[PDB]
Amino acid sequence: SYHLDTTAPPPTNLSTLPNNTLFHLWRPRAHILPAEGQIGDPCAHYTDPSTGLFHVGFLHDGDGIAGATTANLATYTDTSDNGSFLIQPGGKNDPVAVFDGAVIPVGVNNTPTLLYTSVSFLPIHWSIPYTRGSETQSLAVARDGGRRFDKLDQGPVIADHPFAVDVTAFRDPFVFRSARLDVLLSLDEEVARNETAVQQAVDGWTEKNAPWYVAVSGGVHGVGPAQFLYRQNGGNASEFQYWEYLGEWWQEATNSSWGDEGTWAGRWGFNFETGNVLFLTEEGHDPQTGEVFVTLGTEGSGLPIVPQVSSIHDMLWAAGEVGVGSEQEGAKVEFSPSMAGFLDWGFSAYAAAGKVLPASSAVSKTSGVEVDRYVSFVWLTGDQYEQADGFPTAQQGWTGSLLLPRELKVQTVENVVDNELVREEGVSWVVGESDNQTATLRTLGITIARETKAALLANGSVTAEEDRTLQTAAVVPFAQSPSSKFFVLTAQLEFPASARSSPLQSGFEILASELERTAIYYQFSNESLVVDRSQTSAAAPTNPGLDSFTESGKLRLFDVIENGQEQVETLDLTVVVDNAVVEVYANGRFALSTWARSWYDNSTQIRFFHNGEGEVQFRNVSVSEGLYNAWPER
């Protein structure tokens, strides 16, 4: 017998508590997750052509894909009760399980069609032999407003991985259209080599009748991770049965990495997962004019390898160009990375599943958005990918959550001093334009979906803090801190050029009280935003299931000219705290999410933090408390 008293010390072993007793303790209110149970990879999102509603999907309880719908990209509604499942295993093609899938809005019977990985054998992991027929790609059609997906009555449409290729994995199909690919696959190995003649065809490209491409993720044993590319046979937009294989359009050597030291974009690892193919512009998504971007998860491991265990799950992104399939007899087209980085630096952040959100959607119509966007949903595993040291799961009654929907586009950083900080190799940006004096950088833009950001602040209480400058080491409490763990903290930190070489650490302490605190700070030593959770939970000491290791992500603040005078680029911070789900956003190009499971009701204080190394100026600091309820119907 035990009533949850979060004003008293936590019991020694949380796992000895009755089921569902910790259900509300760290559950978010503005995030996407099922009514209960666990949530795995998001997937199968789409805009219903009929209603204009945006459908969101995600694996649930390891027993299929569940769904929800939204008309504003702020509040959601479960497609049904009892789990809200759309499709589950037990069919002829998926007797064992239902893995990730993607949706063609107008496919079979001119309705939303799901191409998903139907599983017939387990286990499946890059570190152990692959069982033939493990993963196949099958079709299902949406029924009753999309509240359910009925499997087509036949075998998989892609019943096997590439011939005689020893794949490590062959799952997570993602569908997309591309003027570039279409053109490259219709010209001559000479008339398609000159980017000139090509562009002429691109300008005349029409999306409506363009064929669909499918990128499948995995790798090849003893060779390396890769993405297998397919497209409706013969480029026939009306062909949903046969998909011609275009080869491994994207591959890397086993455990190789972007850059000469794997500093900015982790490692390619031993296997690719959940690849999404995007075409971004400076305003949003355009399969005709956008640049090719790819988001993916990579599975890593230290040595020695522990078969069936992926010690590292990196949530990466890469940008580059696509060209003809060389002269050799391999892939018909190839993707070459020109820059890469992380979509989210969080250890537990992974398997992002996104989708183009049309300006014609009911969402964009309402918010007055005139362009097409690409919204990405990142997964935040609740138990370190099932490697947690006895997390109190039965006590919590739920596991995992998705992160806030994020808009992806091409971000530009103007007026950047063209120096070594810019010209480094194996980096997460490229020079869009320069004059040897100042340049304009190009990188992946990452922001909270505008409607979600607005809803988070809509009915919130606003409390600002006075501008401040810290030089000597200090921890200064806010003049007034929130009274709950649901708020958005925003702030700008200005650093002196002399801080680059200093051991400076400046930021904030959140979710704090006498016995608990979570520190978020910038560090120049390795140019990273850091989330120290060593003191985050008073319950973690005796409950190793609550991970407390430090989280961090790289963020370079370039030298820029703002008013004729050079200065270190301002660090623009936006930290969203929804209970235990903590998301750190910066300069519209950085994201780091993690779990901050504080125990006490009173751990809501916020404080300025500076280690006394160097100096820091805090500006436009403010806190919006309350957020909102993303699930009104529950």
Ligand X SMILES: OC[C@H]1O[C@@H](O)[C@H](O)[C@@H](O)[C@@H]1O
Contact footprint for its own copies (CB under 8 A): 92-93, 95-96, 120-121, 131-134, 136, 153-157, 159-160, 163-164, 233, 241-242, 244
Q: What is the footprint of ligand X within residues 85-124 (CB under 6 A)?
A: 124
432-435 CB contacts, 8 Å cutoff, 24+ apart: none
Smaller CB separation from ligand X, 274 or 523? 274
Q: What is the footprint of ligand X within residues 125-144 (CB under 6 A)?
A: 125
Smaller CB separation from ligand X, 153 or 327? 153
Provide the phi-psi class of 452: left if phi over 0, else alpha when psi is between -120 and 50, else beta.
alpha
The least CB distance from residue 442 to ligand X, in Å, is: 31
Smaller CB separation from its own copies, 134 or 217? 134
Tokens, residue 373: 């966007």
Phi, psi of 526 (to 5 degrees): -125, 25
196 by Cβ neighbours in 10 Å (0-12 / 13-18 / 19+) ranks as: exposed
The least CB distance from residue 211 to its own copies, in Å, is: 14
Partner that binds at residue 295, options its own copies, ligand X, none, CB closer than 5 to 8 Å by kind: none
In angstroms, the Cα distances linking 268 to 75, 218, 254, 315, 328 are: 36, 11, 7, 10, 24
How many other C-beta atoms lie within 10 A of the C-beta of residue 192?
18
450 binds ligand X (CB under 6 A): no
Measured from each CB, the residue nearest to ligand X is 125
Beta bridge partners of 555: none
The least CB distance from residue 573 to ligand X, in Å, is: 31
299 binds ligand X (CB under 6 A): yes
The least CB distance from residue 69 to its own copies, in Å, is: 31
Partner that binds at residue 423, options its own copies, ligand X, none, CB closer than 5 to 8 Å by kind: none
Contact 210, 177 (CB under 8 A): yes
Report the alpha-carbon distance of residue 179 to residue 206 in Å, rounded: 8
Partner that binds at residue 125, options ligand X, its own copies, none, CB closer than 5 to 8 Å by kind: ligand X
Smaller CB separation from its own copies, 153 or 466? 153
Strands 518-523 and 616-625: unpaired
Reference 353, options 295, 267, 310, 293; nearest CA is: 295
172 binds ligand X (CB under 6 A): no
Smaller CB separation from ligand X, 125 or 450? 125
Tell me how many residues contact ligand X (CB under 6 A): 5
The least CB distance from residue 456 to ligand X, in Å, is: 29
403 binds ligand X (CB under 6 A): no
221 binds ligand X (CB under 6 A): no
Residues in the chain: 634
Partner that binds at residue 93, options ligand X, its own copies, none, CB closer than 5 to 8 Å by kind: its own copies
Report the alpha-carbon distance of residue 40 to residue 351 in Å, rounded: 9
The least CB distance from residue 40 to its own copies, in Å, is: 23
Partner that binds at residue 273, options its own copies, ligand X, none, CB closer than 5 to 8 Å by kind: ligand X
The least CB distance from residue 564 to ligand X, in Å, is: 51
310 binds ligand X (CB under 6 A): yes
The least CB distance from residue 119 to its own copies, in Å, is: 10
Report the alpha-carbon distance of residue 334 to residue 324 in Å, rounded: 6
Report the alpha-carbon distance of residue 311 to residue 308 in Å, rounded: 10
Q: What is the DSSP letter of 360?
A: T
Contact 559, 566 (CB under 8 A): yes
Smaller CB separation from its own copies, 118 or 395? 118
78 binds ligand X (CB under 6 A): no
Partner that binds at residue 310, options its own copies, ligand X, none, CB closer than 5 to 8 Å by kind: ligand X
Tokens, residue 246: 């275009």
Q: What is the DSSP letter of 74?
A: S
Q: What is the DSSP letter of 589?
A: T
Residue for token digits 């014609």? 360
In the shown chain, the binding pattern of residues 247 to 276 toward ligand X, with x for contact by CB under 6 A and - for none, equals --------------------------x---
Cβ neighbours for 329, distance < 8 A, ≥ 6 positions apart: none
The least CB distance from residue 62 to ligand X, in Å, is: 9
Q: What is the dihedral of CA 84, 382, 530, 24, to 10 degrees?
A: 80
The least CB distance from residue 89 to its own copies, in Å, is: 12
Partner that binds at residue 154, options ligand X, its own copies, none, CB closer than 5 to 8 Å by kind: its own copies
Binding residues for ligand X, rule: CB under 6 A, are: 124-125, 273, 299, 310
